[PDB]
Amino acid sequence: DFDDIHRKRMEKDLNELQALIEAHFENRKKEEEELVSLKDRIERRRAERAEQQRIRNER
Amino acid sequence: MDAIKKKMQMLKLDKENALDRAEQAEADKKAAEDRSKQLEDELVSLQKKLKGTED
Amino acid sequence: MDAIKKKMQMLKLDKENALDRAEQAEADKKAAEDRSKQLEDELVSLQKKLKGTED
């Protein structure tokens, strides 16, 4: 009936919506991984700046 | 978030449809039982009329 | 989390409650309908025997 096609329509709506939901989940997840790697290289930069600054100060 | 809202909306569409069907079925039961009991009363009056005719 | 679980469970409970209530109502509707049919069938014969009695 009209209820049947309405149900199938909201069904495929839910399907595409959850699909895009998991999709942006994955996308923002990759972005968070990239940002974590950024933080890690950032702490590497902090440590290297600290050691070279300390060497400069020692001399 | 995003998918969670849509899933909630689906769960709500099921809610509305099930509740509406339940209410409609309850109204149908009320109407049908009223029909049956009125028919039974008509049958009783016919029995009494038959009794008077027999007398 | 916490809110998603409770809301989803409550809504599914609402759907199940409405469904079972509708099924009970429809079962009683079908039974009342068949009993009403029996009442009609008996009432016709009651009328026929009444007509013969009156003749």
PDB file of all heavy atoms in Angstrom, chain A residues 6 10 13-14 17-18 21 24-25, chain B residues 1-4 6-7 10 13 17:
ATOM      1  N   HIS A   6       5.816   3.982   1.521  1.00  0.00           N
ATOM      2  CA  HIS A   6       6.331   4.915   2.516  1.00  0.00           C
ATOM      3  C   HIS A   6       7.351   4.236   3.418  1.00  0.00           C
ATOM      4  O   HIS A   6       8.387   4.823   3.751  1.00  0.00           O
ATOM      5  CB  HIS A   6       5.172   5.478   3.338  1.00  0.00           C
ATOM      6  CG  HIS A   6       5.584   6.475   4.374  1.00  0.00           C
ATOM      7  ND1 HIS A   6       6.434   6.165   5.415  1.00  0.00           N
ATOM      8  CD2 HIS A   6       5.250   7.775   4.542  1.00  0.00           C
ATOM      9  CE1 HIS A   6       6.612   7.232   6.172  1.00  0.00           C
ATOM     10  NE2 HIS A   6       5.902   8.223   5.664  1.00  0.00           N
ATOM     11  N   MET A  10      11.237   5.417   3.759  1.00  0.00           N
ATOM     12  CA  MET A  10      11.932   5.764   4.998  1.00  0.00           C
ATOM     13  C   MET A  10      12.999   4.729   5.312  1.00  0.00           C
ATOM     14  O   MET A  10      14.005   5.030   5.960  1.00  0.00           O
ATOM     15  CB  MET A  10      10.969   5.899   6.162  1.00  0.00           C
ATOM     16  CG  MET A  10      10.091   7.133   5.983  1.00  0.00           C
ATOM     17  SD  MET A  10       9.122   7.426   7.482  1.00  0.00           S
ATOM     18  CE  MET A  10       7.919   6.122   7.333  1.00  0.00           C
ATOM     19  N   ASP A  13      15.888   5.619   3.241  1.00  0.00           N
ATOM     20  CA  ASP A  13      16.383   6.833   3.879  1.00  0.00           C
ATOM     21  C   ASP A  13      17.267   6.496   5.069  1.00  0.00           C
ATOM     22  O   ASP A  13      18.377   7.018   5.189  1.00  0.00           O
ATOM     23  CB  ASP A  13      15.218   7.720   4.318  1.00  0.00           C
ATOM     24  CG  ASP A  13      14.386   8.207   3.153  1.00  0.00           C
ATOM     25  OD1 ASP A  13      14.944   8.367   2.049  1.00  0.00           O
ATOM     26  OD2 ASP A  13      13.169   8.422   3.339  1.00  0.00           O
ATOM     27  N   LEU A  14      16.785   5.632   5.962  1.00  0.00           N
ATOM     28  CA  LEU A  14      17.601   5.178   7.082  1.00  0.00           C
ATOM     29  C   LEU A  14      18.887   4.533   6.595  1.00  0.00           C
ATOM     30  O   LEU A  14      19.956   4.743   7.177  1.00  0.00           O
ATOM     31  CB  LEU A  14      16.804   4.196   7.938  1.00  0.00           C
ATOM     32  CG  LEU A  14      17.622   3.205   8.766  1.00  0.00           C
ATOM     33  CD1 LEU A  14      18.328   3.911   9.915  1.00  0.00           C
ATOM     34  CD2 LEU A  14      16.739   2.079   9.279  1.00  0.00           C
ATOM     35  N   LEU A  17      21.226   7.156   5.244  1.00  0.00           N
ATOM     36  CA  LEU A  17      21.641   8.035   6.328  1.00  0.00           C
ATOM     37  C   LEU A  17      22.664   7.357   7.220  1.00  0.00           C
ATOM     38  O   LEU A  17      23.684   7.959   7.562  1.00  0.00           O
ATOM     39  CB  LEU A  17      20.449   8.476   7.148  1.00  0.00           C
ATOM     40  CG  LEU A  17      20.902   9.510   8.174  1.00  0.00           C
ATOM     41  CD1 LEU A  17      21.600   8.804   9.332  1.00  0.00           C
ATOM     42  CD2 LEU A  17      21.871  10.487   7.517  1.00  0.00           C
ATOM     43  N   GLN A  18      22.417   6.106   7.607  1.00  0.00           N
ATOM     44  CA  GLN A  18      23.397   5.375   8.398  1.00  0.00           C
ATOM     45  C   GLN A  18      24.662   5.124   7.594  1.00  0.00           C
ATOM     46  O   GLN A  18      25.768   5.100   8.145  1.00  0.00           O
ATOM     47  CB  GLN A  18      22.795   4.064   8.901  1.00  0.00           C
ATOM     48  CG  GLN A  18      22.535   3.037   7.814  1.00  0.00           C
ATOM     49  CD  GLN A  18      21.512   2.001   8.222  1.00  0.00           C
ATOM     50  OE1 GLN A  18      20.985   2.038   9.332  1.00  0.00           O
ATOM     51  NE2 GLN A  18      21.229   1.065   7.325  1.00  0.00           N
ATOM     52  N   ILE A  21      26.469   8.230   7.772  1.00  0.00           N
ATOM     53  CA  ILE A  21      26.879   8.402   9.158  1.00  0.00           C
ATOM     54  C   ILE A  21      28.177   7.654   9.412  1.00  0.00           C
ATOM     55  O   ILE A  21      29.156   8.221   9.908  1.00  0.00           O
ATOM     56  CB  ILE A  21      25.790   7.927  10.102  1.00  0.00           C
ATOM     57  CG1 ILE A  21      26.111   8.400  11.517  1.00  0.00           C
ATOM     58  CG2 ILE A  21      25.739   6.403  10.076  1.00  0.00           C
ATOM     59  CD1 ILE A  21      26.062   9.923  11.567  1.00  0.00           C
ATOM     60  N   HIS A  24      31.063   9.511   7.353  1.00  0.00           N
ATOM     61  CA  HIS A  24      31.704  10.637   8.017  1.00  0.00           C
ATOM     62  C   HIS A  24      32.369  10.190   9.310  1.00  0.00           C
ATOM     63  O   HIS A  24      33.348  10.801   9.750  1.00  0.00           O
ATOM     64  CB  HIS A  24      30.698  11.762   8.271  1.00  0.00           C
ATOM     65  CG  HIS A  24      29.695  11.467   9.339  1.00  0.00           C
ATOM     66  ND1 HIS A  24      30.034  11.316  10.666  1.00  0.00           N
ATOM     67  CD2 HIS A  24      28.347  11.340   9.282  1.00  0.00           C
ATOM     68  CE1 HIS A  24      28.943  11.084  11.376  1.00  0.00           C
ATOM     69  NE2 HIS A  24      27.907  11.091  10.558  1.00  0.00           N
ATOM     70  N   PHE A  25      31.858   9.122   9.926  1.00  0.00           N
ATOM     71  CA  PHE A  25      32.579   8.481  11.016  1.00  0.00           C
ATOM     72  C   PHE A  25      33.991   8.141  10.582  1.00  0.00           C
ATOM     73  O   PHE A  25      34.967   8.562  11.207  1.00  0.00           O
ATOM     74  CB  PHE A  25      31.845   7.217  11.453  1.00  0.00           C
ATOM     75  CG  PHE A  25      30.711   7.466  12.388  1.00  0.00           C
ATOM     76  CD1 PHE A  25      29.852   6.440  12.736  1.00  0.00           C
ATOM     77  CD2 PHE A  25      30.499   8.722  12.919  1.00  0.00           C
ATOM     78  CE1 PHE A  25      28.807   6.664  13.603  1.00  0.00           C
ATOM     79  CE2 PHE A  25      29.449   8.954  13.783  1.00  0.00           C
ATOM     80  CZ  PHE A  25      28.601   7.923  14.125  1.00  0.00           C
TER      81      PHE A  25
ATOM     82  N   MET B   1      24.422  12.739  16.970  1.00  0.00           N
ATOM     83  CA  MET B   1      25.294  12.784  15.806  1.00  0.00           C
ATOM     84  C   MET B   1      24.473  12.842  14.523  1.00  0.00           C
ATOM     85  O   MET B   1      23.654  13.738  14.358  1.00  0.00           O
ATOM     86  CB  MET B   1      26.211  11.582  15.781  1.00  0.00           C
ATOM     87  CG  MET B   1      27.363  11.784  16.761  1.00  0.00           C
ATOM     88  SD  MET B   1      26.751  11.716  18.462  1.00  0.00           S
ATOM     89  CE  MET B   1      28.247  12.105  19.344  1.00  0.00           C
ATOM     90  N   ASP B   2      24.698  11.905  13.604  1.00  0.00           N
ATOM     91  CA  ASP B   2      23.965  11.898  12.345  1.00  0.00           C
ATOM     92  C   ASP B   2      23.110  10.657  12.150  1.00  0.00           C
ATOM     93  O   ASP B   2      21.889  10.768  11.997  1.00  0.00           O
ATOM     94  CB  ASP B   2      24.941  12.037  11.171  1.00  0.00           C
ATOM     95  CG  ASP B   2      25.711  13.337  11.214  1.00  0.00           C
ATOM     96  OD1 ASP B   2      26.433  13.555  12.204  1.00  0.00           O
ATOM     97  OD2 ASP B   2      25.594  14.131  10.261  1.00  0.00           O
ATOM     98  N   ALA B   3      23.715   9.470  12.157  1.00  0.00           N
ATOM     99  CA  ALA B   3      22.948   8.250  11.931  1.00  0.00           C
ATOM    100  C   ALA B   3      22.020   7.959  13.103  1.00  0.00           C
ATOM    101  O   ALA B   3      20.946   7.372  12.932  1.00  0.00           O
ATOM    102  CB  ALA B   3      23.895   7.077  11.684  1.00  0.00           C
ATOM    103  N   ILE B   4      22.431   8.360  14.309  1.00  0.00           N
ATOM    104  CA  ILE B   4      21.644   8.077  15.505  1.00  0.00           C
ATOM    105  C   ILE B   4      20.281   8.753  15.427  1.00  0.00           C
ATOM    106  O   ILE B   4      19.251   8.158  15.774  1.00  0.00           O
ATOM    107  CB  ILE B   4      22.430   8.499  16.757  1.00  0.00           C
ATOM    108  CG1 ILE B   4      21.525   8.547  17.983  1.00  0.00           C
ATOM    109  CG2 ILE B   4      23.106   9.833  16.527  1.00  0.00           C
ATOM    110  CD1 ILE B   4      22.247   8.963  19.244  1.00  0.00           C
ATOM    111  N   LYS B   6      18.592   9.565  12.697  1.00  0.00           N
ATOM    112  CA  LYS B   6      17.769   8.877  11.711  1.00  0.00           C
ATOM    113  C   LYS B   6      17.235   7.566  12.262  1.00  0.00           C
ATOM    114  O   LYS B   6      16.075   7.209  12.026  1.00  0.00           O
ATOM    115  CB  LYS B   6      18.562   8.619  10.448  1.00  0.00           C
ATOM    116  CG  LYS B   6      18.882   9.937   9.750  1.00  0.00           C
ATOM    117  CD  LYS B   6      17.591  10.568   9.241  1.00  0.00           C
ATOM    118  CE  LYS B   6      17.918  11.847   8.477  1.00  0.00           C
ATOM    119  NZ  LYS B   6      16.671  12.472   8.013  1.00  0.00           N
ATOM    120  N   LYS B   7      18.072   6.826  12.993  1.00  0.00           N
ATOM    121  CA  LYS B   7      17.615   5.575  13.591  1.00  0.00           C
ATOM    122  C   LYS B   7      16.514   5.830  14.610  1.00  0.00           C
ATOM    123  O   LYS B   7      15.533   5.075  14.685  1.00  0.00           O
ATOM    124  CB  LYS B   7      18.787   4.839  14.230  1.00  0.00           C
ATOM    125  CG  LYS B   7      18.447   3.451  14.705  1.00  0.00           C
ATOM    126  CD  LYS B   7      17.780   2.645  13.611  1.00  0.00           C
ATOM    127  CE  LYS B   7      17.421   1.255  14.092  1.00  0.00           C
ATOM    128  NZ  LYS B   7      16.629   0.505  13.083  1.00  0.00           N
ATOM    129  N   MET B  10      13.336   6.386  12.696  1.00  0.00           N
ATOM    130  CA  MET B  10      12.749   5.114  12.278  1.00  0.00           C
ATOM    131  C   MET B  10      12.017   4.446  13.435  1.00  0.00           C
ATOM    132  O   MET B  10      10.888   3.954  13.277  1.00  0.00           O
ATOM    133  CB  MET B  10      13.815   4.175  11.755  1.00  0.00           C
ATOM    134  CG  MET B  10      14.363   4.696  10.430  1.00  0.00           C
ATOM    135  SD  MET B  10      15.471   6.097  10.732  1.00  0.00           S
ATOM    136  CE  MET B  10      16.068   6.377   9.077  1.00  0.00           C
ATOM    137  N   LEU B  13       8.738   6.210  13.831  1.00  0.00           N
ATOM    138  CA  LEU B  13       7.750   5.870  12.812  1.00  0.00           C
ATOM    139  C   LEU B  13       7.096   4.533  13.127  1.00  0.00           C
ATOM    140  O   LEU B  13       5.871   4.383  13.030  1.00  0.00           O
ATOM    141  CB  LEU B  13       8.407   5.841  11.431  1.00  0.00           C
ATOM    142  CG  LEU B  13       8.097   7.028  10.519  1.00  0.00           C
ATOM    143  CD1 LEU B  13       8.511   8.325  11.179  1.00  0.00           C
ATOM    144  CD2 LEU B  13       8.783   6.871   9.175  1.00  0.00           C
ATOM    145  N   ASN B  17       3.031   4.048  13.904  1.00  0.00           N
ATOM    146  CA  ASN B  17       2.230   3.107  13.129  1.00  0.00           C
ATOM    147  C   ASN B  17       1.650   2.006  14.012  1.00  0.00           C
ATOM    148  O   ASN B  17       0.462   1.674  13.904  1.00  0.00           O
ATOM    149  CB  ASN B  17       3.070   2.515  12.000  1.00  0.00           C
ATOM    150  CG  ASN B  17       3.463   3.554  10.974  1.00  0.00           C
ATOM    151  OD1 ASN B  17       2.677   4.432  10.633  1.00  0.00           O
ATOM    152  ND2 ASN B  17       4.691   3.463  10.483  1.00  0.00           N
TER     153      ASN B  17
END
